[PDB]
Design an enzyme around this catalytic site. Structure first.
Site, PDB file in Angstrom:
ATOM      1  CB  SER A  45     -25.663  32.369  25.058  1.00 27.44           C
ATOM      2  OG  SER A  45     -25.003  33.343  26.040  1.00 27.44           O
ATOM      3  CB  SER A 105     -29.222  35.190  23.609  1.00 26.38           C
ATOM      4  OG  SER A 105     -28.679  34.102  24.007  1.00 26.38           O
ATOM      5  CD  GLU A 141     -25.385  34.280  30.322  1.00 25.05           C
ATOM      6  OE1 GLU A 141     -25.855  33.012  29.428  1.00 25.05           O
ATOM      7  OE2 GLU A 141     -24.554  35.041  29.980  1.00 25.05           O
ATOM      8  CE  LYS A 209     -28.795  31.210  22.805  1.00 26.78           C
ATOM      9  NZ  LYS A 209     -27.835  32.059  21.987  1.00 26.78           N
ATOM     10  CB  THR A 210     -25.334  31.641  17.961  1.00 24.77           C
ATOM     11  OG1 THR A 210     -26.005  32.732  18.698  1.00 24.77           O
ATOM     12  CG2 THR A 210     -25.690  31.283  16.887  1.00 24.77           C
ATOM     13  N   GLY A 211     -23.820  31.383  20.461  1.00 24.26           N
ATOM     14  CA  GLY A 211     -23.341  32.172  21.599  1.00 24.26           C
ATOM     15  C   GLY A 211     -21.764  32.640  21.271  1.00 24.26           C
ATOM     16  CB  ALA A 212     -20.900  36.049  21.496  1.00 27.96           C
TER      17      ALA A 212
END
Ligand SMILES: OC[C@H]1O[C@H](O[C@H]2[C@H](O)[C@@H](O)[C@H](OCCCCCCC3CCCCC3)O[C@@H]2CO)[C@H](O)[C@@H](O)[C@@H]1O
Ligand SMILES: *C(=O)/C=C/N[C@@H](C(=O)O)[C@](C)(COC(=O)CCCC(=O)O)S(=O)O
Length: 265
Positions: A45, A105, A141, A209-212
């Protein structure tokens, strides 16, 4: 906490995975810490910030408006659409879509925006246009965070992502208002921002901004600094670790603790 580099190494040892990291002065681009900075990691993300940089570039050129309302259908929604699923009847503005993509997100918001910039290929072309010849988006996505071992699709490198974020936020490629908007969306992150503030000592600025993703993939692109200033860009990616989400979060936080305790370098 030990020195940043020592902590990063310790995190790889404990996670059995690869960590990629860059710490860079926002104003000048000075690189302070670089670990596996030229190695590839899934963006997950975190790509949403670059996506909205492309949207803002279109707004600056007169080819888009943040006010423009986009109407979409239920069949268009993909997994995890906390904001977009609530607006099937009235639609969302392009600006609202970017806010949902970056601060919540929201995946459908991201896909709707991705289409407006020419899809994965269009966003990758935008990256090449601003001088990033490494970062690449290949899928939509939510397939883009599959993180298959050795798969170059949908990846960036810590060095490329840090340089690209700095270009979007400060190089004047985007208008003053657009640079300010992109920054504010990161400041407004609802996924991790409040949580990070709850564990940061008083005086430390955070925007992020995070992501996984799969196979332990995890990451964060952030602005951090003392005296309530966005002094440095910090990019950290993790991949190929079987660890729990809690432990991946703790290791990233541990690297941040090392930076905080040894800031003057
Ligand atoms: O001496 C420095 C500080 O040391 C401690 O602070 C701790 C804090 O109590 C802990 O909660 C945090 O964890 C780190 C939390 C980091 C969370 C995310 C960081 C992000 C930011 C940028 C991108 C990557 C990760 O570490 C600091 C430094 O040891 C003391 O509690 C504090 O009073 C003191 O000012
Ligand atoms: C972006 O990184 C999204 C990652 N995970 C989502 C996805 O695969 O689309 C999930 C649906 C989880 O989403 C969240 O937990 C919300 C926050 C996502 C973020 O950190 O940006 S999947 O279960 O991994």
């Amino acid at each position: 906490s030990p020195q940043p580099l020592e902590q990063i190494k310790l995190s790889e040892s404990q996670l059995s995975g690869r960590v990629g990291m860059i710490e860079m002065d926002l104003a000048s681009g000075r690189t302070l810490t670089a670990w596996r900075a030229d190695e590839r990691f899934p963006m997950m993300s975190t790509f949403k910030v670059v996506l909205c940089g492309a949207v803002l570039a279109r707004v600056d050129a007169g080819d888009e408006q943040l006010e423009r309302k986009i109407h979409y259908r239920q069949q268009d929604l993909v997994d995890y659409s906390p904001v977009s699923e609530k607006h099937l009847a009235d639609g969302m503005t392009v600006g609202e879509l970017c806010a949902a993509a970056i601060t919540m997100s929201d995946n459908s918001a991201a896909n709707l925006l991705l289409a407006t910039v020419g899809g994965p290929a269009g966003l990758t072309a935008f990256l090449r246009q601003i001088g990033d010849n490494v970062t690449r988006l290949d899928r939509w996505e939510t397939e883009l965070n599959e993180a298959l071992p050795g798969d170059a699709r949908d990846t960036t490198t810590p060095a490329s992502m840090a340089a690209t974020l700095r270009k979007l936020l400060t190089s004047q490629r985007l208008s003053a208002r657009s640079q300010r908007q992109l920054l504010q969306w990161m400041v407004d992150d609802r996924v991790a921002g409040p949580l990070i503030r709850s564990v940061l000592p008083a005086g430390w600025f955070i925007a992020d901004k995070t992501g996984a993703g799969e196979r332990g993939a995890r990451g964060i692109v952030a602005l951090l600094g003392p005296n309530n200033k966005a002094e440095r860009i910090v990019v950290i990616y993790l991949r190929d670790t079987p660890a729990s989400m809690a432990e991946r979060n703790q290791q990233i936080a541990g690297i941040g603790a090392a930076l905080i305790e040894h800031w003057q370098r």
